[PDB]
Amino acid sequence: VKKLINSQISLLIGKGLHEFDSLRDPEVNDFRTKMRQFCEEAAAHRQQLGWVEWLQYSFPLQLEPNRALLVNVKFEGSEESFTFQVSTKDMPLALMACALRKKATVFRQQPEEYALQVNGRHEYLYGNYPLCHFQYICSCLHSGLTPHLTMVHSSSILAMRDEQSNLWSLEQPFSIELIEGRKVNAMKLVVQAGLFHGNEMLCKTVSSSEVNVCSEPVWKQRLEFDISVCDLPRMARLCFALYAVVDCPIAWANLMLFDYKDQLKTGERCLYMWPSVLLNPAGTVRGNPNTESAAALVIYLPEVAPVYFPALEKILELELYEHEKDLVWKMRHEVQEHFPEALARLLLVTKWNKHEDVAQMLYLLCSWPELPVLSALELLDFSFPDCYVGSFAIKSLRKLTDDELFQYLLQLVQVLKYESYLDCELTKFLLGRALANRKIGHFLFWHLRSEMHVPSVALRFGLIMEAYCRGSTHHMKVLMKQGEALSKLKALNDFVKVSSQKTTKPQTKEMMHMCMRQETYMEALSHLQSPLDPSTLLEEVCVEQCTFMDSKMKPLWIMYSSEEAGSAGNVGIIFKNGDDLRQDMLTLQMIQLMDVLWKQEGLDLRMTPYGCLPTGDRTGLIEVVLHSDTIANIQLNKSNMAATAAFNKDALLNWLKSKNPGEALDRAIEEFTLSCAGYCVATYVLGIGDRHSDNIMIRESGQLFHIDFGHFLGNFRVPFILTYDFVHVIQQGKTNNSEKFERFRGYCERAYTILRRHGLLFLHLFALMRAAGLPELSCSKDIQYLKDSLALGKTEEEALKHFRVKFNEALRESW
Ligand SMILES: Cc1ccccc1-n1c(Cn2nc(C#CCO)c3c(N)ncnc32)nc2cccc(C)c2c1=O
């Protein structure tokens, strides 16, 4: 049976476990077995959680950042249901009290023994919270809909839990022998080596001598570095570049001078090199897995005697101008005593190529108080390679709530790429958090699963997903069920592209359905948790309603229903294969983040944060927003329709009218204006260009939102943007309506200002994303786009002035 589990894992993680053994690699082995131990202890913990604690683990609450309402409630056993009137202000327990008072009266006759499930969802209502704090209850009020809940008894919840069971002495200047290579070019070759700690070099980059273009080159020479061997910090990173010239890059390669046992490396080494777009400190520190084809650099770390980096207790024993640096360093204790939040800045002035200073720094670091989360996110930047700093940052990060953790999960995952060794605090942290919360577990998995086609991370990511699994057998099954669905989706989509290239849409659509109607597909595509959101159940796929966009990548449109979930189980997923969804996902997360920040100062711009989730190689899902359509479509202004207008500019408004009769119209225009402001500021701050009426959509509520991102931070300076046809809708259909127009400027103005206040949060976040290799996010010039857009260097009186110019500027540009 342990064989079954094993093969399921390899199947799930897209890498077979045998590959881990084949490497006969102590680091991997250690990682594997420690991390297995760790996770199995988590899982053990879990299997004995109390039932309310299990609910917390498995269906964590979904909260928002007096008045009446109809709620429909019923119990698990029977179909009989009651529709109560309760306040929006009542705790779930009041509602439960009612249910039971009604059950008792009908059924002829203990609220604390219950949780309320949202029907047809993995979602629950419990805790000491008024109902309109629950996103679902909240969502329902906004759309008019009657919450539909089931009284689920403690014995039943427990029944679920049960089913889910499983030194200083060495002062000579550091040096290497470059022996030779085995590679491909056109011209002479050179090797450049430099020793890095983070971005900053520990001295100059002693190159090679020029040698002929050749294929199996030989060097046999000492390169000696301008730094004492007893200096080298724990995280010293030796970096090579191989190029050709009469400048033209071929390959690059990095390694730690110390290994994971804190032993300085000796002697020889063959470095399987990575292809080029000269020096790449950021790049991974483990070799190219394609050993057949890769250029190989053989080098010689010499035996300076074994040599270990000193224990902590031995250590404990022992932008700004030149002088300013000197002063911080001097005032470092006082910096610790009175400004504990300036650590980053002090850390960037400590002399990392002088061991004594790194001792003095560390000793302060070791007594340093914990920092706020925002500061910790900054310390995770690659500028802080030291693991004592890493350890510090994780320790400060422990106070992250699950919602926040979820919020920055994509970034923390990306930062694993910076990591120097497989076993590290960040891995332990995330795994601990993922094992403690099934939603984090879900998304960690997919963040990882989705990058397995990527050589430099395949091993690392593979090993974590393995760990996770050892820690959650049941969740593993739930995830294979997702994997099988995505596998069928890929097959289905390939059929679609081949076929559509030979036949009319109607025909391929017919063909797609037959394919889908195969037992093997109905089985695969049904009865699963959405990878976009584990608390959304994809029950039966509605073949009749599925189709595909007959352009470009031919993405698929997959609809699903649920009897038990009714309306709210009528949900859809888009499956796209062929494009990178990373850019899209990132963009959508940042907007979602804007929305959370705005709501936290009580400003709700009625945003539409739909899931977008990469799952594999140029493959992921996008969550369908129903009841929506593009501006472009609407603006096609077709005859024999409700919106049929005398003037094109009326199209969009007629559409809204037709979707929103009588008194409803006002609120629609209101939703439109609110979301409009939101999206306007978000695209503007983010530098999202090439908006046009094809990539904007409105929902029937009037809510406006954006699709197909792929160009941000100004990677065409993006002006703020006002479309006349929106300005026309904001104005209630009037040529001049400056009451309504200026309320709009107001909203834009509030949302702009709130974002500036968390400017640092975006910066630190994007800082972390640089780890991802997204081509529109490659260097400073990009993070600078954000500084400029949030005019972060200015005062709030100023920036607002600045913004006002831009906004008026956009107004002129509107017709
Ligand atoms: C539904 C629709 C109306 C107007 C114009 C285009 C669409 N649309 C869209 C427009 N669209 N784009 C979306 C997106 C995205 C990420 O950039 C999207 C969404 N999340 N929810 C609803 N609609 C969305 N996407 C499709 C994807 C696959 C298959 C199909 C048939 C479509 C599709 O028809």
PDB file of all heavy atoms in Angstrom, residues 597-598 685 750-762 787-800 803:
ATOM      1  N   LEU A 597      -7.293  46.370   0.486  1.00  0.00           N
ATOM      2  CA  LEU A 597      -6.895  47.660   1.084  1.00  0.00           C
ATOM      3  C   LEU A 597      -8.054  48.660   1.055  1.00  0.00           C
ATOM      4  O   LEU A 597      -8.336  49.273   2.058  1.00  0.00           O
ATOM      5  CB  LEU A 597      -5.668  48.254   0.393  1.00  0.00           C
ATOM      6  CG  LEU A 597      -4.524  47.270   0.364  1.00  0.00           C
ATOM      7  CD1 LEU A 597      -3.444  47.751  -0.553  1.00  0.00           C
ATOM      8  CD2 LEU A 597      -4.014  47.003   1.805  1.00  0.00           C
ATOM      9  N   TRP A 598      -8.732  48.821  -0.072  1.00  0.00           N
ATOM     10  CA  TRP A 598      -9.837  49.820  -0.139  1.00  0.00           C
ATOM     11  C   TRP A 598     -10.981  49.495   0.854  1.00  0.00           C
ATOM     12  O   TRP A 598     -11.421  50.339   1.669  1.00  0.00           O
ATOM     13  CB  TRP A 598     -10.385  49.921  -1.545  1.00  0.00           C
ATOM     14  CG  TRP A 598      -9.405  50.490  -2.574  1.00  0.00           C
ATOM     15  CD1 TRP A 598      -8.477  51.482  -2.370  1.00  0.00           C
ATOM     16  CD2 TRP A 598      -9.325  50.152  -3.977  1.00  0.00           C
ATOM     17  NE1 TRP A 598      -7.826  51.768  -3.545  1.00  0.00           N
ATOM     18  CE2 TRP A 598      -8.336  50.989  -4.553  1.00  0.00           C
ATOM     19  CE3 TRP A 598      -9.992  49.226  -4.798  1.00  0.00           C
ATOM     20  CZ2 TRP A 598      -7.971  50.915  -5.939  1.00  0.00           C
ATOM     21  CZ3 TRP A 598      -9.660  49.162  -6.199  1.00  0.00           C
ATOM     22  CH2 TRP A 598      -8.649  50.007  -6.743  1.00  0.00           C
ATOM     23  N   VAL A 685      -2.151  52.875 -11.876  1.00  0.00           N
ATOM     24  CA  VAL A 685      -1.048  52.567 -10.970  1.00  0.00           C
ATOM     25  C   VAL A 685      -0.185  51.439 -11.538  1.00  0.00           C
ATOM     26  O   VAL A 685       1.010  51.620 -11.665  1.00  0.00           O
ATOM     27  CB  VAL A 685      -1.518  52.235  -9.537  1.00  0.00           C
ATOM     28  CG1 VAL A 685      -0.335  51.870  -8.675  1.00  0.00           C
ATOM     29  CG2 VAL A 685      -2.225  53.419  -8.925  1.00  0.00           C
ATOM     30  N   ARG A 750      -9.977  58.920  -3.717  1.00  0.00           N
ATOM     31  CA  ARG A 750      -9.851  58.119  -2.459  1.00  0.00           C
ATOM     32  C   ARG A 750      -9.012  56.858  -2.675  1.00  0.00           C
ATOM     33  O   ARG A 750      -8.140  56.528  -1.875  1.00  0.00           O
ATOM     34  CB  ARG A 750     -11.191  57.692  -1.829  1.00  0.00           C
ATOM     35  CG  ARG A 750     -11.843  58.653  -0.861  1.00  0.00           C
ATOM     36  CD  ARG A 750     -13.378  58.433  -0.722  1.00  0.00           C
ATOM     37  NE  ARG A 750     -13.831  57.452   0.299  1.00  0.00           N
ATOM     38  CZ  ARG A 750     -13.094  56.887   1.278  1.00  0.00           C
ATOM     39  NH1 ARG A 750     -11.794  57.157   1.443  1.00  0.00           N
ATOM     40  NH2 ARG A 750     -13.667  56.031   2.120  1.00  0.00           N
ATOM     41  N   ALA A 751      -9.289  56.153  -3.765  1.00  0.00           N
ATOM     42  CA  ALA A 751      -8.637  54.863  -4.051  1.00  0.00           C
ATOM     43  C   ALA A 751      -7.188  55.046  -4.389  1.00  0.00           C
ATOM     44  O   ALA A 751      -6.339  54.214  -4.000  1.00  0.00           O
ATOM     45  CB  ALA A 751      -9.332  54.143  -5.202  1.00  0.00           C
ATOM     46  N   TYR A 752      -6.896  56.120  -5.124  1.00  0.00           N
ATOM     47  CA  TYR A 752      -5.494  56.455  -5.379  1.00  0.00           C
ATOM     48  C   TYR A 752      -4.749  56.685  -4.067  1.00  0.00           C
ATOM     49  O   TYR A 752      -3.708  56.075  -3.844  1.00  0.00           O
ATOM     50  CB  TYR A 752      -5.338  57.664  -6.293  1.00  0.00           C
ATOM     51  CG  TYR A 752      -3.899  57.953  -6.576  1.00  0.00           C
ATOM     52  CD1 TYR A 752      -3.082  56.995  -7.152  1.00  0.00           C
ATOM     53  CD2 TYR A 752      -3.342  59.191  -6.261  1.00  0.00           C
ATOM     54  CE1 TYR A 752      -1.740  57.258  -7.440  1.00  0.00           C
ATOM     55  CE2 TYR A 752      -1.984  59.466  -6.525  1.00  0.00           C
ATOM     56  CZ  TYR A 752      -1.198  58.490  -7.116  1.00  0.00           C
ATOM     57  OH  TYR A 752       0.125  58.758  -7.380  1.00  0.00           O
ATOM     58  N   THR A 753      -5.299  57.539  -3.205  1.00  0.00           N
ATOM     59  CA  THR A 753      -4.655  57.844  -1.928  1.00  0.00           C
ATOM     60  C   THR A 753      -4.539  56.625  -0.974  1.00  0.00           C
ATOM     61  O   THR A 753      -3.557  56.500  -0.236  1.00  0.00           O
ATOM     62  CB  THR A 753      -5.317  59.057  -1.212  1.00  0.00           C
ATOM     63  OG1 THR A 753      -6.742  58.975  -1.338  1.00  0.00           O
ATOM     64  CG2 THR A 753      -4.889  60.355  -1.876  1.00  0.00           C
ATOM     65  N   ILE A 754      -5.498  55.710  -0.991  1.00  0.00           N
ATOM     66  CA  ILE A 754      -5.362  54.605  -0.085  1.00  0.00           C
ATOM     67  C   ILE A 754      -4.157  53.763  -0.538  1.00  0.00           C
ATOM     68  O   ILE A 754      -3.262  53.461   0.281  1.00  0.00           O
ATOM     69  CB  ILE A 754      -6.660  53.790   0.076  1.00  0.00           C
ATOM     70  CG1 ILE A 754      -7.729  54.586   0.880  1.00  0.00           C
ATOM     71  CG2 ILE A 754      -6.377  52.415   0.675  1.00  0.00           C
ATOM     72  CD1 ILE A 754      -9.220  54.387   0.389  1.00  0.00           C
ATOM     73  N   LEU A 755      -4.085  53.435  -1.828  1.00  0.00           N
ATOM     74  CA  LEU A 755      -2.936  52.694  -2.336  1.00  0.00           C
ATOM     75  C   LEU A 755      -1.579  53.310  -2.000  1.00  0.00           C
ATOM     76  O   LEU A 755      -0.633  52.590  -1.655  1.00  0.00           O
ATOM     77  CB  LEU A 755      -3.054  52.500  -3.840  1.00  0.00           C
ATOM     78  CG  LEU A 755      -4.297  51.740  -4.335  1.00  0.00           C
ATOM     79  CD1 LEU A 755      -4.041  51.443  -5.779  1.00  0.00           C
ATOM     80  CD2 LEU A 755      -4.558  50.444  -3.509  1.00  0.00           C
ATOM     81  N   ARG A 756      -1.469  54.639  -2.065  1.00  0.00           N
ATOM     82  CA  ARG A 756      -0.195  55.281  -1.714  1.00  0.00           C
ATOM     83  C   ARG A 756       0.221  54.970  -0.303  1.00  0.00           C
ATOM     84  O   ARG A 756       1.413  54.880   0.016  1.00  0.00           O
ATOM     85  CB  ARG A 756      -0.265  56.771  -1.860  1.00  0.00           C
ATOM     86  CG  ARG A 756      -0.071  57.208  -3.219  1.00  0.00           C
ATOM     87  CD  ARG A 756       0.092  58.697  -3.272  1.00  0.00           C
ATOM     88  NE  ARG A 756       1.469  59.135  -3.062  1.00  0.00           N
ATOM     89  CZ  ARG A 756       1.913  59.780  -1.980  1.00  0.00           C
ATOM     90  NH1 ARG A 756       1.085  60.021  -0.978  1.00  0.00           N
ATOM     91  NH2 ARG A 756       3.187  60.178  -1.896  1.00  0.00           N
ATOM     92  N   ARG A 757      -0.755  54.817   0.566  1.00  0.00           N
ATOM     93  CA  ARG A 757      -0.402  54.516   1.928  1.00  0.00           C
ATOM     94  C   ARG A 757       0.153  53.127   2.115  1.00  0.00           C
ATOM     95  O   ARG A 757       0.839  52.912   3.072  1.00  0.00           O
ATOM     96  CB  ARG A 757      -1.573  54.751   2.852  1.00  0.00           C
ATOM     97  CG  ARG A 757      -1.951  56.170   2.888  1.00  0.00           C
ATOM     98  CD  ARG A 757      -2.854  56.416   4.025  1.00  0.00           C
ATOM     99  NE  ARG A 757      -3.310  57.786   3.888  1.00  0.00           N
ATOM    100  CZ  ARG A 757      -4.558  58.129   3.614  1.00  0.00           C
ATOM    101  NH1 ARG A 757      -5.489  57.170   3.476  1.00  0.00           N
ATOM    102  NH2 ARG A 757      -4.861  59.433   3.501  1.00  0.00           N
ATOM    103  N   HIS A 758      -0.126  52.196   1.221  1.00  0.00           N
ATOM    104  CA  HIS A 758       0.485  50.875   1.297  1.00  0.00           C
ATOM    105  C   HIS A 758       1.457  50.715   0.151  1.00  0.00           C
ATOM    106  O   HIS A 758       1.738  49.611  -0.318  1.00  0.00           O
ATOM    107  CB  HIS A 758      -0.584  49.803   1.218  1.00  0.00           C
ATOM    108  CG  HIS A 758      -1.564  49.876   2.341  1.00  0.00           C
ATOM    109  ND1 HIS A 758      -2.721  50.631   2.276  1.00  0.00           N
ATOM    110  CD2 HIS A 758      -1.536  49.325   3.576  1.00  0.00           C
ATOM    111  CE1 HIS A 758      -3.378  50.519   3.414  1.00  0.00           C
ATOM    112  NE2 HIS A 758      -2.684  49.722   4.212  1.00  0.00           N
ATOM    113  N   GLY A 759       1.955  51.844  -0.316  1.00  0.00           N
ATOM    114  CA  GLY A 759       2.913  51.844  -1.383  1.00  0.00           C
ATOM    115  C   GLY A 759       3.993  50.877  -1.064  1.00  0.00           C
ATOM    116  O   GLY A 759       4.297  50.016  -1.866  1.00  0.00           O
ATOM    117  N   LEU A 760       4.551  50.981   0.130  1.00  0.00           N
ATOM    118  CA  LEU A 760       5.636  50.073   0.492  1.00  0.00           C
ATOM    119  C   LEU A 760       5.238  48.625   0.338  1.00  0.00           C
ATOM    120  O   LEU A 760       6.071  47.805  -0.075  1.00  0.00           O
ATOM    121  CB  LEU A 760       6.148  50.294   1.910  1.00  0.00           C
ATOM    122  CG  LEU A 760       6.964  51.569   2.099  1.00  0.00           C
ATOM    123  CD1 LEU A 760       6.925  52.012   3.551  1.00  0.00           C
ATOM    124  CD2 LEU A 760       8.375  51.387   1.607  1.00  0.00           C
ATOM    125  N   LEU A 761       3.999  48.289   0.679  1.00  0.00           N
ATOM    126  CA  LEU A 761       3.594  46.901   0.584  1.00  0.00           C
ATOM    127  C   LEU A 761       3.733  46.376  -0.874  1.00  0.00           C
ATOM    128  O   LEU A 761       4.311  45.296  -1.090  1.00  0.00           O
ATOM    129  CB  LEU A 761       2.188  46.693   1.155  1.00  0.00           C
ATOM    130  CG  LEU A 761       1.532  45.339   0.922  1.00  0.00           C
ATOM    131  CD1 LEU A 761       2.217  44.238   1.695  1.00  0.00           C
ATOM    132  CD2 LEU A 761       0.100  45.430   1.335  1.00  0.00           C
ATOM    133  N   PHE A 762       3.252  47.147  -1.856  1.00  0.00           N
ATOM    134  CA  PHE A 762       3.379  46.756  -3.274  1.00  0.00           C
ATOM    135  C   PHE A 762       4.829  46.604  -3.706  1.00  0.00           C
ATOM    136  O   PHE A 762       5.213  45.590  -4.304  1.00  0.00           O
ATOM    137  CB  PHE A 762       2.642  47.729  -4.195  1.00  0.00           C
ATOM    138  CG  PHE A 762       1.151  47.719  -3.998  1.00  0.00           C
ATOM    139  CD1 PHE A 762       0.550  48.580  -3.089  1.00  0.00           C
ATOM    140  CD2 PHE A 762       0.354  46.834  -4.712  1.00  0.00           C
ATOM    141  CE1 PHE A 762      -0.806  48.555  -2.892  1.00  0.00           C
ATOM    142  CE2 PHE A 762      -1.016  46.792  -4.519  1.00  0.00           C
ATOM    143  CZ  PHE A 762      -1.596  47.652  -3.607  1.00  0.00           C
ATOM    144  N   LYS A 787       6.969  53.214  -8.121  1.00  0.00           N
ATOM    145  CA  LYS A 787       7.338  54.449  -7.417  1.00  0.00           C
ATOM    146  C   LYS A 787       6.730  55.650  -8.107  1.00  0.00           C
ATOM    147  O   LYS A 787       6.055  56.455  -7.479  1.00  0.00           O
ATOM    148  CB  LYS A 787       8.851  54.659  -7.377  1.00  0.00           C
ATOM    149  CG  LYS A 787       9.675  53.577  -6.689  1.00  0.00           C
ATOM    150  CD  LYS A 787      10.935  54.204  -6.081  1.00  0.00           C
ATOM    151  CE  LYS A 787      11.928  53.169  -5.578  1.00  0.00           C
ATOM    152  NZ  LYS A 787      11.369  52.369  -4.438  1.00  0.00           N
ATOM    153  N   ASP A 788       6.967  55.787  -9.402  1.00  0.00           N
ATOM    154  CA  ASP A 788       6.430  56.935 -10.121  1.00  0.00           C
ATOM    155  C   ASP A 788       4.900  56.983 -10.085  1.00  0.00           C
ATOM    156  O   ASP A 788       4.331  58.027  -9.778  1.00  0.00           O
ATOM    157  CB  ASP A 788       6.967  56.970 -11.545  1.00  0.00           C
ATOM    158  CG  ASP A 788       8.491  57.053 -11.584  1.00  0.00           C
ATOM    159  OD1 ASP A 788       9.069  57.821 -10.784  1.00  0.00           O
ATOM    160  OD2 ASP A 788       9.119  56.346 -12.410  1.00  0.00           O
ATOM    161  N   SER A 789       4.240  55.859 -10.354  1.00  0.00           N
ATOM    162  CA  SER A 789       2.781  55.842 -10.402  1.00  0.00           C
ATOM    163  C   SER A 789       2.141  56.166  -9.030  1.00  0.00           C
ATOM    164  O   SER A 789       1.196  56.973  -8.931  1.00  0.00           O
ATOM    165  CB  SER A 789       2.246  54.533 -11.019  1.00  0.00           C
ATOM    166  OG  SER A 789       2.197  53.490 -10.079  1.00  0.00           O
ATOM    167  N   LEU A 790       2.667  55.573  -7.971  1.00  0.00           N
ATOM    168  CA  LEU A 790       2.180  55.906  -6.650  1.00  0.00           C
ATOM    169  C   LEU A 790       2.818  57.203  -6.132  1.00  0.00           C
ATOM    170  O   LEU A 790       2.750  57.509  -4.936  1.00  0.00           O
ATOM    171  CB  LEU A 790       2.444  54.748  -5.678  1.00  0.00           C
ATOM    172  CG  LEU A 790       1.746  53.389  -5.894  1.00  0.00           C
ATOM    173  CD1 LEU A 790       2.310  52.299  -4.971  1.00  0.00           C
ATOM    174  CD2 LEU A 790       0.215  53.518  -5.769  1.00  0.00           C
ATOM    175  N   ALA A 791       3.445  57.967  -7.031  1.00  0.00           N
ATOM    176  CA  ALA A 791       4.250  59.132  -6.639  1.00  0.00           C
ATOM    177  C   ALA A 791       4.669  59.028  -5.178  1.00  0.00           C
ATOM    178  O   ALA A 791       4.290  59.868  -4.357  1.00  0.00           O
ATOM    179  CB  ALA A 791       3.480  60.413  -6.885  1.00  0.00           C
ATOM    180  N   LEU A 792       5.441  57.994  -4.850  1.00  0.00           N
ATOM    181  CA  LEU A 792       5.653  57.649  -3.449  1.00  0.00           C
ATOM    182  C   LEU A 792       6.619  58.609  -2.770  1.00  0.00           C
ATOM    183  O   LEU A 792       6.532  58.812  -1.561  1.00  0.00           O
ATOM    184  CB  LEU A 792       6.091  56.197  -3.299  1.00  0.00           C
ATOM    185  CG  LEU A 792       5.571  55.325  -2.129  1.00  0.00           C
ATOM    186  CD1 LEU A 792       6.176  55.703  -0.720  1.00  0.00           C
ATOM    187  CD2 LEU A 792       4.052  55.246  -2.080  1.00  0.00           C
ATOM    188  N   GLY A 793       7.499  59.237  -3.550  1.00  0.00           N
ATOM    189  CA  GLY A 793       8.477  60.173  -3.003  1.00  0.00           C
ATOM    190  C   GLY A 793       7.905  61.514  -2.561  1.00  0.00           C
ATOM    191  O   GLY A 793       8.590  62.306  -1.915  1.00  0.00           O
ATOM    192  N   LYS A 794       6.654  61.787  -2.926  1.00  0.00           N
ATOM    193  CA  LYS A 794       6.066  63.104  -2.677  1.00  0.00           C
ATOM    194  C   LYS A 794       5.159  63.099  -1.462  1.00  0.00           C
ATOM    195  O   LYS A 794       4.834  62.055  -0.882  1.00  0.00           O
ATOM    196  CB  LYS A 794       5.240  63.582  -3.864  1.00  0.00           C
ATOM    197  CG  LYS A 794       5.907  63.540  -5.198  1.00  0.00           C
ATOM    198  CD  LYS A 794       5.272  64.600  -6.106  1.00  0.00           C
ATOM    199  CE  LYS A 794       5.424  64.261  -7.590  1.00  0.00           C
ATOM    200  NZ  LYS A 794       6.843  64.322  -8.044  1.00  0.00           N
ATOM    201  N   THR A 795       4.726  64.293  -1.097  1.00  0.00           N
ATOM    202  CA  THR A 795       3.769  64.469  -0.027  1.00  0.00           C
ATOM    203  C   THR A 795       2.395  64.141  -0.595  1.00  0.00           C
ATOM    204  O   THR A 795       2.223  64.153  -1.818  1.00  0.00           O
ATOM    205  CB  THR A 795       3.784  65.913   0.435  1.00  0.00           C
ATOM    206  OG1 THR A 795       2.836  66.660  -0.337  1.00  0.00           O
ATOM    207  CG2 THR A 795       5.186  66.498   0.261  1.00  0.00           C
ATOM    208  N   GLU A 796       1.424  63.860   0.278  1.00  0.00           N
ATOM    209  CA  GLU A 796       0.055  63.581  -0.166  1.00  0.00           C
ATOM    210  C   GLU A 796      -0.664  64.802  -0.777  1.00  0.00           C
ATOM    211  O   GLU A 796      -1.549  64.645  -1.616  1.00  0.00           O
ATOM    212  CB  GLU A 796      -0.784  62.981   0.959  1.00  0.00           C
ATOM    213  CG  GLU A 796      -2.019  62.231   0.439  1.00  0.00           C
ATOM    214  CD  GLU A 796      -3.207  62.257   1.397  1.00  0.00           C
ATOM    215  OE1 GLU A 796      -3.180  61.501   2.409  1.00  0.00           O
ATOM    216  OE2 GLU A 796      -4.181  63.024   1.115  1.00  0.00           O
ATOM    217  N   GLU A 797      -0.294  66.012  -0.363  1.00  0.00           N
ATOM    218  CA  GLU A 797      -0.866  67.196  -0.973  1.00  0.00           C
ATOM    219  C   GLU A 797      -0.345  67.241  -2.408  1.00  0.00           C
ATOM    220  O   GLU A 797      -1.112  67.491  -3.349  1.00  0.00           O
ATOM    221  CB  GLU A 797      -0.480  68.455  -0.189  1.00  0.00           C
ATOM    222  CG  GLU A 797      -1.429  69.664  -0.355  1.00  0.00           C
ATOM    223  CD  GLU A 797      -2.648  69.570   0.558  1.00  0.00           C
ATOM    224  OE1 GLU A 797      -3.534  68.705   0.297  1.00  0.00           O
ATOM    225  OE2 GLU A 797      -2.698  70.345   1.549  1.00  0.00           O
ATOM    226  N   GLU A 798       0.951  66.945  -2.559  1.00  0.00           N
ATOM    227  CA  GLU A 798       1.629  66.973  -3.859  1.00  0.00           C
ATOM    228  C   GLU A 798       1.073  65.920  -4.802  1.00  0.00           C
ATOM    229  O   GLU A 798       0.325  66.252  -5.715  1.00  0.00           O
ATOM    230  CB  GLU A 798       3.152  66.828  -3.721  1.00  0.00           C
ATOM    231  CG  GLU A 798       3.848  68.092  -3.193  1.00  0.00           C
ATOM    232  CD  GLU A 798       5.351  67.923  -2.960  1.00  0.00           C
ATOM    233  OE1 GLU A 798       5.948  66.925  -3.439  1.00  0.00           O
ATOM    234  OE2 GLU A 798       5.933  68.805  -2.285  1.00  0.00           O
ATOM    235  N   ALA A 799       1.423  64.656  -4.570  1.00  0.00           N
ATOM    236  CA  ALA A 799       0.886  63.510  -5.341  1.00  0.00           C
ATOM    237  C   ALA A 799      -0.570  63.673  -5.836  1.00  0.00           C
ATOM    238  O   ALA A 799      -0.869  63.421  -6.997  1.00  0.00           O
ATOM    239  CB  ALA A 799       1.055  62.205  -4.546  1.00  0.00           C
ATOM    240  N   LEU A 800      -1.464  64.108  -4.955  1.00  0.00           N
ATOM    241  CA  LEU A 800      -2.835  64.415  -5.326  1.00  0.00           C
ATOM    242  C   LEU A 800      -2.914  65.497  -6.424  1.00  0.00           C
ATOM    243  O   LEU A 800      -3.696  65.379  -7.375  1.00  0.00           O
ATOM    244  CB  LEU A 800      -3.584  64.857  -4.083  1.00  0.00           C
ATOM    245  CG  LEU A 800      -5.065  64.555  -3.988  1.00  0.00           C
ATOM    246  CD1 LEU A 800      -5.330  63.242  -4.667  1.00  0.00           C
ATOM    247  CD2 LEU A 800      -5.495  64.525  -2.518  1.00  0.00           C
ATOM    248  N   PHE A 803      -1.583  63.688  -9.536  1.00  0.00           N
ATOM    249  CA  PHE A 803      -2.708  62.906  -9.994  1.00  0.00           C
ATOM    250  C   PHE A 803      -3.793  63.757 -10.699  1.00  0.00           C
ATOM    251  O   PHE A 803      -4.320  63.353 -11.745  1.00  0.00           O
ATOM    252  CB  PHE A 803      -3.297  62.128  -8.810  1.00  0.00           C
ATOM    253  CG  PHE A 803      -4.379  61.162  -9.195  1.00  0.00           C
ATOM    254  CD1 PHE A 803      -4.059  59.901  -9.678  1.00  0.00           C
ATOM    255  CD2 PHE A 803      -5.713  61.516  -9.071  1.00  0.00           C
ATOM    256  CE1 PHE A 803      -5.033  59.021 -10.034  1.00  0.00           C
ATOM    257  CE2 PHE A 803      -6.705  60.641  -9.425  1.00  0.00           C
ATOM    258  CZ  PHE A 803      -6.368  59.398  -9.924  1.00  0.00           C
TER     259      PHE A 803
END
